[PDB]
Design an enzyme around this catalytic site. Structure first.
Site, PDB file in Angstrom:
ATOM      1  N   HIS A 128      70.606  93.107  55.348  1.00 53.65           N
ATOM      2  CA  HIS A 128      72.424  92.934  55.518  1.00 53.65           C
ATOM      3  C   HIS A 128      73.409  92.717  55.096  1.00 53.65           C
ATOM      4  O   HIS A 128      74.747  93.508  54.810  1.00 53.65           O
ATOM      5  CB  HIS A 128      72.482  91.536  56.463  1.00 53.65           C
ATOM      6  CG  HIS A 128      72.681  90.325  55.899  1.00 53.65           C
ATOM      7  ND1 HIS A 128      70.809  89.452  56.440  1.00 53.65           N
ATOM      8  CD2 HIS A 128      72.609  89.261  55.706  1.00 53.65           C
ATOM      9  CE1 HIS A 128      70.581  88.190  54.962  1.00 53.65           C
ATOM     10  NE2 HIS A 128      72.491  88.025  54.913  1.00 53.65           N
ATOM     11  N   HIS A 143      77.927  86.494  47.852  1.00 52.34           N
ATOM     12  CA  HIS A 143      77.801  87.559  48.868  1.00 52.34           C
ATOM     13  C   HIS A 143      78.928  88.203  49.318  1.00 52.34           C
ATOM     14  O   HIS A 143      80.051  86.849  49.308  1.00 52.34           O
ATOM     15  CB  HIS A 143      76.570  87.459  50.084  1.00 52.34           C
ATOM     16  CG  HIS A 143      76.751  86.484  50.715  1.00 52.34           C
ATOM     17  ND1 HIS A 143      76.933  84.928  51.184  1.00 52.34           N
ATOM     18  CD2 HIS A 143      77.308  87.252  52.548  1.00 52.34           C
ATOM     19  CE1 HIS A 143      77.016  84.682  52.846  1.00 52.34           C
ATOM     20  NE2 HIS A 143      77.953  85.892  52.770  1.00 52.34           N
ATOM     21  N   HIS A 177      81.296  90.672  52.043  1.00 55.70           N
ATOM     22  CA  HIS A 177      80.754  91.235  53.259  1.00 55.70           C
ATOM     23  C   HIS A 177      82.144  92.323  53.070  1.00 55.70           C
ATOM     24  O   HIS A 177      82.975  92.485  52.815  1.00 55.70           O
ATOM     25  CB  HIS A 177      81.245  90.545  55.019  1.00 55.70           C
ATOM     26  CG  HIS A 177      80.422  89.363  55.249  1.00 55.70           C
ATOM     27  ND1 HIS A 177      79.514  89.343  56.035  1.00 55.70           N
ATOM     28  CD2 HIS A 177      79.878  88.134  54.799  1.00 55.70           C
ATOM     29  CE1 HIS A 177      78.710  88.142  56.093  1.00 55.70           C
ATOM     30  NE2 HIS A 177      79.110  87.202  55.118  1.00 55.70           N
ATOM     31  N   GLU A 234      85.520  88.886  57.385  1.00 51.79           N
ATOM     32  CA  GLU A 234      85.343  88.352  58.423  1.00 51.79           C
ATOM     33  C   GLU A 234      85.980  87.113  59.190  1.00 51.79           C
ATOM     34  O   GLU A 234      86.961  87.788  59.968  1.00 51.79           O
ATOM     35  CB  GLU A 234      83.956  87.514  58.095  1.00 51.79           C
ATOM     36  CG  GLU A 234      82.875  88.535  57.689  1.00 51.79           C
ATOM     37  CD  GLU A 234      81.437  87.087  57.854  1.00 51.79           C
ATOM     38  OE1 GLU A 234      81.489  86.814  57.767  1.00 51.79           O
ATOM     39  OE2 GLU A 234      80.654  88.560  58.245  1.00 51.79           O
ATOM     40  N   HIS A 279      81.899  85.253  49.914  1.00 48.96           N
ATOM     41  CA  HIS A 279      81.696  83.938  50.052  1.00 48.96           C
ATOM     42  C   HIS A 279      80.716  83.139  49.071  1.00 48.96           C
ATOM     43  O   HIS A 279      79.780  84.287  48.395  1.00 48.96           O
ATOM     44  CB  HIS A 279      80.859  84.174  51.778  1.00 48.96           C
ATOM     45  CG  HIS A 279      81.213  84.049  52.989  1.00 48.96           C
ATOM     46  ND1 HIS A 279      80.671  84.509  54.318  1.00 48.96           N
ATOM     47  CD2 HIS A 279      82.786  84.233  52.787  1.00 48.96           C
ATOM     48  CE1 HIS A 279      81.567  85.068  54.987  1.00 48.96           C
ATOM     49  NE2 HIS A 279      82.767  84.752  54.209  1.00 48.96           N
TER      50      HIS A 279
HETATM   51 HG   LIG Z   1      68.786  91.108  56.964  1.00 50.74          HG
HETATM   52 ZN   LIG Z   2      79.186  85.596  54.403  1.00 53.79          ZN
END
Ligand SMILES: [Hg+2]
Ligand SMILES: [Zn+2]
Length: 257
Positions: free
Chosen positions: A61, A91, A93, A103, A116
């Site tokens: 992800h 991590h 996004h 986000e 984050h």
């Molecule tokens: Hg995942």
């Molecule tokens: Zn995050």
């Protein structure tokens, strides 16, 4: 399972994780004109000088840079927080294009990416116990915009080649997270949740106002990662962000006038 595509993306999460429609979901839009300065917030304290990174992992992800959290090294405290929160991993996004990927949003503006840094409340002893508490986590959120390169990020960028597909990891020791912070620690804070399933509502969000700049070339390498595992049809790892959720009964506080 869950992902960001049309058949398993954010609009589907609620069926396995009903809390997706809960009272303190994240991310949210930060309306600067509704946020209020809070004179009662103490100064924020980011102590990352003894941080010990260990490994980097493509979890299908995003990619997680993991830290040894078996002792009080890298900690976040002050600001809206009570006590000590220990860094466990960071991590990002990001989007398929520069006009999307963050986000949280600021007056509806979407940044190209969002970092984050996840921390857990040491009075609960471990991460797994912390995520069963309303004040178990503290996440430091930092926006990324595309401009000049961020020197501190290049070692991250350089290793992505070796963790292209889901399930791969590489040793990633001695990385210093201080190189991903902007100059100012001015922030917005509000109570919310993790933004990936299981979407637990255990987080005190601390979103920095000042974004960091990263180069087009740096973000472009993020976009070469894979959501799939080795040997599977290539699905680029892009647009791994959840959009803004209802603010409900929450107030966003500003640390600055
Ligand atoms: Hg995942
Ligand atoms: Zn995050």
């Amino acid at each position: 399972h869950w992902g960001y595509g049309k058949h398993n993306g954010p609009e589907h999460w609620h069926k396995d994780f009903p809390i997706a429609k809960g009272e303190r979901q994240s991310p949210v839009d930060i309306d600067t004109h509704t946020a209020k300065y809070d004179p009662s917030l103490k100064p924020l304290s980011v102590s990352y000088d003894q941080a010990t990174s260990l490994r980097i992992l493509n979890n299908g992800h995003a990619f997680n840079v993991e830290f040894d959290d078996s002792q009080d090294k890298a900690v976040l405290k002050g600001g809206p927080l009570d006590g000590t929160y220990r860094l466990i991993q960071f991590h990002f996004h990001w989007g398929s294009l520069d006009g999307q990927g963050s986000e949280h949003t600021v007056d509806k503006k979407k940044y190209a990416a969002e970092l984050h840094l996840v921390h857990w409340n040491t009075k609960y002893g471990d991460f797994g116990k912390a995520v069963q508490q309303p004040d178990g986590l503290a996440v430091l959120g930092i926006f990324l915009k595309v401009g000049s390169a961020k020197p501190g990020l290049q070692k991250v960028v350089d290793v992505l080649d070796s963790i292209k597909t889901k399930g791969k990891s590489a040793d990633f020791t001695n990385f210093d997270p201080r190189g991903l912070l902007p100059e100012s620690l001015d922030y917005w804070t509000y109570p919310g949740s993790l933004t990936t399933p299981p979407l637990l509502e255990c987080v005190t969000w601390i979103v920095l106002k000042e974004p960091i700049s990263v180069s087009s070339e740096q973000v472009l390498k993020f976009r070469k990662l894979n959501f799939n595992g080795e040997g599977e049809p290539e699905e680029l790892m892009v647009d791994n962000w959840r959009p803004a959720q209802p603010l409900k009964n929450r107030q966003i506080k500003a640390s600055f006038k």
